[PDB]
Amino acid sequence: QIFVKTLTGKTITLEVESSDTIDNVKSKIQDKEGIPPDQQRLIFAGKQ
Amino acid sequence: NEVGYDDIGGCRKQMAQIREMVELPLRHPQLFKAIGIKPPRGVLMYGPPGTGKTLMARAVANETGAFFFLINGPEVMSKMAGESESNLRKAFEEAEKNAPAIIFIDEIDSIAPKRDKTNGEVERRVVSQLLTLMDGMKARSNVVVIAATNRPNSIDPALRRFGRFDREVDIGIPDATGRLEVLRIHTKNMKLADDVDLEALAAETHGYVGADIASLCSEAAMQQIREKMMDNFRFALGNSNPSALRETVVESVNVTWDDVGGLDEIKEELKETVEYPVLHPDQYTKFGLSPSKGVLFYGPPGTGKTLLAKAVATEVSANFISVKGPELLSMWYGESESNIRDIFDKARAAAPTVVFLDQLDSIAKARGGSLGDAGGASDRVVNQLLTEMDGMNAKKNVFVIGATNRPDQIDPAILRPGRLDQLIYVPLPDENARLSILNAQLRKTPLEPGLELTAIAKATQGFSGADLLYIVQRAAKYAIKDSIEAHRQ
Amino acid sequence: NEVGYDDIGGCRKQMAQIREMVELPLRHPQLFKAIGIKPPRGVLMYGPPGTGKTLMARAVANETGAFFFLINGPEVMSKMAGESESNLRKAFEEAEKNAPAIIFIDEIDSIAPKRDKTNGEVERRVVSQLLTLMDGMKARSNVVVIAATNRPNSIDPALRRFGRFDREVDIGIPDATGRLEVLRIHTKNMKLADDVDLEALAAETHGYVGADIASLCSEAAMQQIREKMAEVLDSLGVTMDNFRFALGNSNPSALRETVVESVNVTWDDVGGLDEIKEELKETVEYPVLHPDQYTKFGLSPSKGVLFYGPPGTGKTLLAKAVATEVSANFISVKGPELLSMWYGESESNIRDIFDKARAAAPTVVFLDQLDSIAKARGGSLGDAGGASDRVVNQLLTEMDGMNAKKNVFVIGATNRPDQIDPAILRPGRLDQLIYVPLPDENARLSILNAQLRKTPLEPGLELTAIAKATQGFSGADLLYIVQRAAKYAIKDSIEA
């Protein structure tokens, strides 16, 4: 004719937010992004 | 899609006061300038879900031509507590740009819960963003916010204080004429015949929420399609389950005061107490205190106690709290006195509403200073019964019935005018009441009129009415056997 | 390799309910559905795990030539919120351009559980997008979403509204006529077989679902290879005892949970008690065989029958033959089995079986040995008597508070019929006063027809001689005169 009562407790979280390895950024630089319409980029030649 | 004002009814008394709350400050904002005060910003709605809470906001939006912004409850709160505060900042900024505008939100209990002992949720950073956003913006801007929820008491009390959500409306279940109006709306396109009824089809439902009317019409229409390779509405009630399935709002037995006979010292003595303050309260405010809540029923077993329980509950068409005898579940030591209090507060919210109990008088056995006793139940739950029964209010006029079969164990503190005081002995049905009970029960039987029940009343002298119900059951069970041996030959 | 037309036994009597919601929007929208009724799109398949829905949804796509999809519950929802939304959005726009299409969803309970104690809000994000995308497809999109789960009560009640999910079809466990086609499919791929029919082996495998039957043909085929090690394919013809070996090491699907199947007991296994049999053919069989007869008079039949007598007769043992005749479930509870150990721990354990008694209908519930509850009304005035007054009003209010239109019945059989509670012998709860004594002395030869049939001397006059000797012999003691055959005749006949 009796009872059992017990509560609980929690811990939410911690974070660091660590990212961006160096090998991904070196591949991130050597690319293209697009050029409007007529914004050619050119070639050039010389030094015969 | 494109809904209007004439698509829903029942809450027309509340629909008129809504049209002066969200259309009058938007169409005429200069009327509040002449009176000086600011127009109200927040009005919320509640009730059972599926009475058209989301369809009501879309009806008044298309009938005004204003901007209609929508933020869903369980959608924007499921993010990682960083984009919800910017979505609410984007909500009020876009509504200010294209004024006049309304803002409809639904399921605000999922956004704004209450603070309780079970801490561990987020419960912050989103509703506090709504607090600092709503208290401003009142520089005669044509913007209003409309909230919608299911449980109106799980909301945080900081919202319903002042200036944020001050006006409330209670769109509940419709009446018998309310379901009759939505039956004509949902059957405007189905080519029915002349055999269907509308008043009898609405009266045979008696507990159906407005979302069921679209489902019950499509179930009967699908049955009519299947017979090609129109009274199929009664087939749809036997197949489909009504909404609010396993709650305390059950209504499936439609026994009225005609189907129950006799006991004229109880029918007029129940009309004196539970129909007079709920219909004519103008005389009760100048002739003492209004309500006569408690009433007791005692007598022999099977004397017709609960036969009149659902009969009075369907006369005024109010709610019927069907709490059984051992409903004090008593899983521990403290919740056994607490689970009886929220059902009393629910009776005050849905007032007037009849509450039923059975044999909960246990303070005569709860003597002081002994050894044989329980661990906190059946001796301290009567101390809660000595303080939660007379918790009355003049704006509710509730009433509670009580049926027992042992009037010798009545507590000396429960037979009091502050408790259930009106005790009425339910006697045996005499030779005049035996005909009034049994003839109303074989009304559904297509019987022959040669057999009169006066011979049954002469053969039953000390029989109860439930024992007479076995006689018409045995007469019907052998009429089934008379019908079984009629189609095989 | 794809599925055939039907390809599953034990479902052809209910496969039309899933089928008829498919062709009727497309094969006739002019004369059948242009009245102004929108097509229902949400169905709900459920049942025990192993009835084969996943396939059943493949069979209706092959029979109609419609496009098929595959979405698993814990698979797509285990991705990110934006990732699961993009897979959900790209599946419905793909289904629009190839109408008719079938979108199969499985395991709804993992996506939408109940909200009684499941705290947190990560589940309500994805189920709000499912109800959103099910609305704007009104005009000509021939799509029917198939939701697959196990229990119908575990799904949220918000999903069962108008237009979202309407059809709740339940493919059940097949009988011997149903599972015979399942054995016919998984044996036509075999080279040879025995000269014994498969219905003789499927008669004892009653509570075996048709996913286990696909394994038992393979479970006995490998023992045929293990028995040896057309030159090695002559052993591939399975024998009737290797099925018994497969039944000897069988893992029954009903054994993995509680056993609630219907036993194969009948009325010819007992001798006598025919006055009870003619009374117990009207109370629970006439509502379920002729459901329109009691609705003509508007009076439902009586729910509840009470037995009382000596513990020797079969009053608790013949009640299983009452429910199993019309294939109803049997739940047997005992009086002094569950009680109030702590305080109030019995009334919650009484109404916990009433909800599942009407969900899986037809079921019955068998209350037995009421000499621990129905004896205390005004006699016991102790502390246990105060707890006795709290436990007897639970079942007294539940006898008239139960739903009597869901063919749920109580059957009682209790000794000591003098001190029964007076509020349980009232009509409506227990009104069939049927006394069950020991059976008659001339009806005791018909008891022994079940257990033994083969006797080279054919007795039956000496067994009635000791039956007619005295009236004090019980209905179970004379059944034990052939239960002692292993001590009488089988003992001295196996030494060879």
Ligand SMILES: Nc1ncnc2c1ncn2[C@@H]1O[C@H](COP(=O)(O)OP(=O)(O)OP(=O)(O)O)[C@@H](O)[C@H]1O
């Ligand atoms: N006057 C009315 N009363 C009740 N139901 C109506 C009425 N008019 C239409 N209905 C039907 O009821 C449905 C309204 O349900 P609704 O869209 O409000 O769901 P809800 O669950 O109440 O909304 P929420 O998700 O905000 O709780 C409509 O689909 C419509 O067919």
Ligand SMILES: Nc1ncnc2c1ncn2[C@@H]1O[C@H](COP(=O)(O)OP(=O)(O)OP(=O)(O)O)[C@@H](O)[C@H]1O
């Ligand atoms: N006016 C009446 N007089 C006598 N019997 C009635 C009357 N109306 C209905 N009855 C029958 O009596 C039964 C009422 O039983 P109920 O359990 O409600 O009260 P009861 O028999 O007094 O039970 P209890 O003794 O537990 O209070 C119904 O099943 C009904 O058929």
Ligand SMILES: Nc1ncnc2c1ncn2[C@@H]1O[C@H](COP(=O)(O)OP(=O)(O)OP(=O)(O)O)[C@@H](O)[C@H]1O
């Ligand atoms: N008519 C039939 N009834 C029962 N079982 C069948 C039938 N026909 C084939 N089977 C066998 O039963 C299996 C079907 O099980 P299924 O693939 O549906 O698993 P399931 O657990 O039901 O699916 P889900 O993962 O969606 O729950 C098949 O592997 C098949 O061999």
Ligand SMILES: Nc1ncnc2c1ncn2[C@@H]1O[C@H](COP(=O)(O)OP(=O)(O)O)[C@@H](O)[C@H]1O
């Ligand atoms: N017609 C019958 N004649 C003799 N014995 C029977 C008969 N029916 C059942 N039994 C025996 O009685 C048992 C089932 O009923 P029983 O256990 O006697 O219930 P109770 O003990 O409550 O009377 C079975 O084990 C069976 O052997």
